[PDB]
Amino acid sequence: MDDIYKAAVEQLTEEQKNEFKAAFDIFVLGAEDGSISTKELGKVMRMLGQNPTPEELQEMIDEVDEDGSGTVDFDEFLVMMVRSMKDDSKGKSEEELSDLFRMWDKNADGYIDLDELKIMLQATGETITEDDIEELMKDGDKNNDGRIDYDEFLEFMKGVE
């Protein structure tokens, strides 16, 4: 069963790449080739903050090792990593968008206005004249709204952040 995963890995994001070498480097501890033993494959999951099950793992390799080596290589890990992702109830970017929405909305309205837009100037430092504040608002507004909602706000940063 490699195809079922090939679809998840090919559709995955660069994130999985960082989280991979990030932890992988820990096990290998900066070595030439540190293949995480299957028996440890159950520990790597717990190290990623979660409720793994090393008891079921033994049942997997017992019937099929997906290779018959006894160790965990790159592909093996990358596959298992996403293998768990399957069937879940928590996977959205909104959670992260909520944070930003607040940074650009610190009052009690829940909408990014002209005054909330200029805030960007401080987020970067100092540059351009007031025209920058008006221009921006014109690039995000003037579309029959008069203001900047969430879907409109998050959509902006989703294309430049």
UniProtKB/Swiss-Prot annotation:
The modification N-acetylmethionine is found at residue 1. GO terms for cellular component: cardiac Troponin complex; cytosol; sarcomere; troponin complex. Ca(2+) 1 binds at residues 65, 67, 69, 71, 76. GO terms for molecular function: actin filament binding; calcium ion binding; calcium-dependent protein binding; protein homodimerization activity; troponin I binding; troponin T binding. Ca(2+) 3 binds at residues 141, 143, 145, 147, 152. Changing residue 29 to Q: In CMH13; impairs protein kinase A dependent signaling from cardiac troponin I to troponin C. InterPro entries: CALM/Myosin/TropC-like (IPR050230), EF-hand-dom_pair (IPR011992), EF_Hand_1_Ca_BS (IPR018247), EF_hand_dom (IPR002048). It comes from the Eukaryota. Residues 16-51, 52-87, 92-127, 128-161 form the EF-hand domain. Gene3D superfamilies: EF-hand. One of its GO terms (biological process) is skeletal muscle contraction. Ca(2+) 2 binds at residues 105, 107, 109, 111, 116. The modification Phosphoserine is found at residue 98. CDD domains: EFh. Keywords: Acetylation, Calcium, Cardiomyopathy, Disease variant, Metal-binding, Muscle protein, Phosphoprotein, Repeat. Troponin is the central regulatory protein of striated muscle contraction. Tn consists of three components: Tn-I which is the inhibitor of actomyosin ATPase, Tn-T which contains the binding site for tropomyosin and Tn-C. The binding of calcium to Tn-C abolishes the inhibitory action of Tn on actin filaments. Belongs to the troponin C family. It is linked to Cardiomyopathy, dilated, 1Z: A disorder characterized by ventricular dilation and impaired systolic function, resulting in congestive heart failure and arrhythmia. Patients are at risk of premature death. Cardiomyopathy, familial hypertrophic, 13: A hereditary heart disorder characterized by ventricular hypertrophy, which is usually asymmetric and often involves the interventricular septum. The symptoms include dyspnea, syncope, collapse, palpitations, and chest pain. They can be readily provoked by exercise. The disorder has inter- and intrafamilial variability ranging from benign to malignant forms with high risk of cardiac failure and sudden cardiac death. Cardiac muscle Tn-C can bind 3 calcium ions per molecule. Domain I does not bind calcium. This is Troponin C, slow skeletal and cardiac muscles. It comes from Homo sapiens.
